[PDB]
Amino acid sequence: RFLKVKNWETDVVLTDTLHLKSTLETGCTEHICMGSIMLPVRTKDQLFPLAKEFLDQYYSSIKRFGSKAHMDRLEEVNKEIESTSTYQLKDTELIYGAKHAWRNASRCVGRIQWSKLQVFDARDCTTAHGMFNYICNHVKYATNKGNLRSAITIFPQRTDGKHDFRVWNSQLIRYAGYKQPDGSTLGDPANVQFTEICIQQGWKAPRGRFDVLPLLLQANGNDPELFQIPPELVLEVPIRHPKFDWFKDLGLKWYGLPAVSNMLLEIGGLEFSACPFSGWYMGTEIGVRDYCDNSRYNILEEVAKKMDLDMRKTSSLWKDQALVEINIAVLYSFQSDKVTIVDHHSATESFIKHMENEYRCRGGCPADWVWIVPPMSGSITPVFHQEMLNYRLTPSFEYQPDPWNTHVWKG
Amino acid sequence: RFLKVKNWETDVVLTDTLHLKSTLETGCTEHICMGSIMLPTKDQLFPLAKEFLDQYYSSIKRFGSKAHMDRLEEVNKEIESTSTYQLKDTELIYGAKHAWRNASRCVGRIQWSKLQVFDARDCTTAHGMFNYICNHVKYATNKGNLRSAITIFPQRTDGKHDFRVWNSQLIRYAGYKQPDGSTLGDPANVQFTEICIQQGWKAPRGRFDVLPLLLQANGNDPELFQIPPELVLEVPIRHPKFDWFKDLGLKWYGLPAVSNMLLEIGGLEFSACPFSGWYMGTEIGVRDYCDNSRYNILEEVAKKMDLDMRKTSSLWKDQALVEINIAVLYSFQSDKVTIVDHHSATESFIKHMENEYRCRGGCPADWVWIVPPMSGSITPVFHQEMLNYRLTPSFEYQPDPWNTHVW
Ligand code: HEM
Ligand code: HEM
């Protein structure tokens, strides 16, 4: 079975066979496409096959499929499962799994980098204090004084779902949001609810516009504990504009390290519920979404005001003009401070090269167009005209519900 | 069974039930989403007729009435005897409006009920077709105050007597491959232009030559006609701030009129059904002007603005893109030719979608096409979950005639 994707700018046509290895489901049917829906404990029984497909993939990749070492490993894992209802990954398999979850992440435009990922094995961690230490080391290593390096830290896997390791923060580094009695927000509206939890847990909120949130860390199903990342580890960039001298007086900054900390890494049926991972930013994540979403910092008006754009009619494209200037500012600031960042032209062009290479070497590259296309200037990037096939491969990153909704408080 | 869509900007949640009345297939499966793919008998006909007439009589609040049963009976008798049937004028108008209403990729559907339907089912020759089309064009243009219109030529019979407009739009510019190696005019139309030349068209070989119509009646060989130039309203493109802009020699036509699609109503197939509205600015300024495989003007404009084109990260493409789109909108507005910007159009669509949810139980929408090709996330549609499904009546793609036609 073969599936073809066309690029409508280049007429380049690719053939996907990889989708035949797809296990998980999409949410779509022959009658309904759910392609724009944001969010569409295992038995021994289900675990054996999952482990086996994983180990088959792993041993093929090292050109050892069907070897004695492959067979012995299957036998050993099977025995471990029947006897203990679960199993332990070798370090090599963990590394491979983590790299593959990234490689398989169809919503990630940054996948050209998938094979350079530093894996920190934190499966010997037992306490929230232990977690804090691992996370500090990850932050320092990944930050690398502005010369960012991709990394993931992997905490112990789920057992009975009652002893989960979780990082309650959605990202390791994020700014607090405070709902004011007059209904306005100070700082980042995205993080109001989590900020409230931190405050309730005893965090002394400075109540500024750019307060780095404390880490809220849960080990072994215990109640989460608050920790402050050492400020000297939190690299930040003041935002200025190359031509507009008043831009700095907007008082904007952002942090350099994007580190997603609330997803679940699934490898060979095992579930790693705390697996913070980090890379570097594409400029639009900050300049389009973080700054210009109406539900976020929402700075478009103020920027357009200072530029004295005609704001009486939308058809002046004042929003669009301000949007570009903000995004220029973000890239210029990160570059000037030597903090790794990639523009959306460069990221999408690299992604297209990655995608074609993946088709050639792997038989496919699952990709979610809705997410891959940048949130500004969509059609002047090469991904816009690229047909993509979206399907779900394992290993994978998955969403999980926010822990404050599910946690059984011990007291 | 009942499906929820969330807006991530406003937290508003809508419940879709309309998808259960879905009847065509999406191309997707539980294993693979094809969301981003551009183009994924008597016995068959009666269910299709019944389905349609049920929705029609329901709409005029006469479901299960004698007039309903009688028409169902009438159409059935017509099919068994003739192997097809004819729509009443009222049914035709209902069907056409609903094909638009159901167009999941159309952002402008708030307008769906205000569609002027021209019944050209009495047409028999390519000459008749040309007359009907000039009239549509003049009506729709309305000296710049544009009005939505569709013109419906006779339905398919045995498939050997198809009416087709060979053009993809009623008004488009020619494309010519040059000894130079580059393309003159619109590169999207090079194959069609050559077909026009090989049919006898005297091509002026300019950058903006309005293509002639190539009309096929009753399955006959297609004939050429030039639309009266006085009926083709065009707009010279200037910028409100940059005086050099006009020097690029850019213009575009006022009337977007898609002419190559197939209208399907109650199993009947209208293979020639040109329809028109008015432009959203980005269609011209982003796609027509800036696509690499179209007029591809970004480099020239960036140059004139004296932007630093050394590095992608200066966002010179993005800067030029915005300016090109300001010029488009400015030029149309100044010349009083109806146009909508992507902010206004997407805001309207959100309002339409909420109307459709509360009055119909849903609104099929294809996010990939609805989100504008520039500034996506600063339009409300970006943050709106949409369910995409296929309802009938509908507009469908069909193979280009030069592949299908037997000469
Ligand atoms: C190296 C630099 C990277 C860049 C520039 C990059 C870029 C991006 C961007 C722009 C998004 C969409 C984000 C949004 O709109 O919220 C994304 C999504 C994602 N990335 Fe990356 N990425 C990078 C590295 C990584 C790494 C190291 C991992 C994991 C090891 C990763 C896994 C993911 C996943 C799982 C998603 C989508 C989440 C979902 O399914 O909703 N990426 N990437
Ligand atoms: C009146 C103002 C209208 C506006 C502003 C508008 C807007 C648009 C836009 C921007 C597109 C995307 C086109 C592209 O990217 O190539 C589109 C698609 C489409 N529109 Fe409209 N439209 C209008 C009127 C109409 C009318 C009158 C009809 C039919 C009666 C129609 C039916 C369609 C269909 C079928 C598609 C998508 C074709 C496909 O499936 O690929 N629209 N619309």
Ligand SMILES: Cc1cc(N)nc(CCc2cccc(CCc3cc(C)cc(N)n3)n2)c1
């Ligand atoms: C359910 C849901 C709701 C919502 N509003 N947002 C999300 C997105 C969460 C997420 C996942 C992966 C990457 C990023 C964006 C952050 C990021 C991470 C890395 C590793 C690199 C990079 N350039 N950027 N953000 C999910």
Ligand SMILES: Cc1cc(N)nc(CCc2cccc(CCc3cc(C)cc(N)n3)n2)c1
């Ligand atoms: C074969 C094929 C290939 C391809 N790459 N794209 C297409 C799209 C055809 C099409 C359909 C509807 C509207 C428009 C865009 C033109 C248009 C039409 C109307 C009625 C209003 C408006 N504002 N704009 N264009 C077809």
Ligand SMILES: C[C@H](O)[C@H](O)[C@H]1CNc2nc(N)[nH]c(=O)c2N1
């Ligand atoms: C591959 C992808 O489906 C293709 O580029 C689409 C994307 N979205 C689009 N959206 C609109 N409105 N019009 C288009 O022509 C396209 N092209």
Ligand SMILES: C[C@H](O)[C@H](O)[C@H]1CNc2nc(N)[nH]c(=O)c2N1
């Ligand atoms: C409704 C829609 O799926 C949602 O707004 C998506 C669209 N595309 C996106 N793309 C990226 N990269 N990030 C996002 O948060 C979103 N949001």
Ligand SMILES: [Zn+2]
């Ligand atoms: Zn789908």
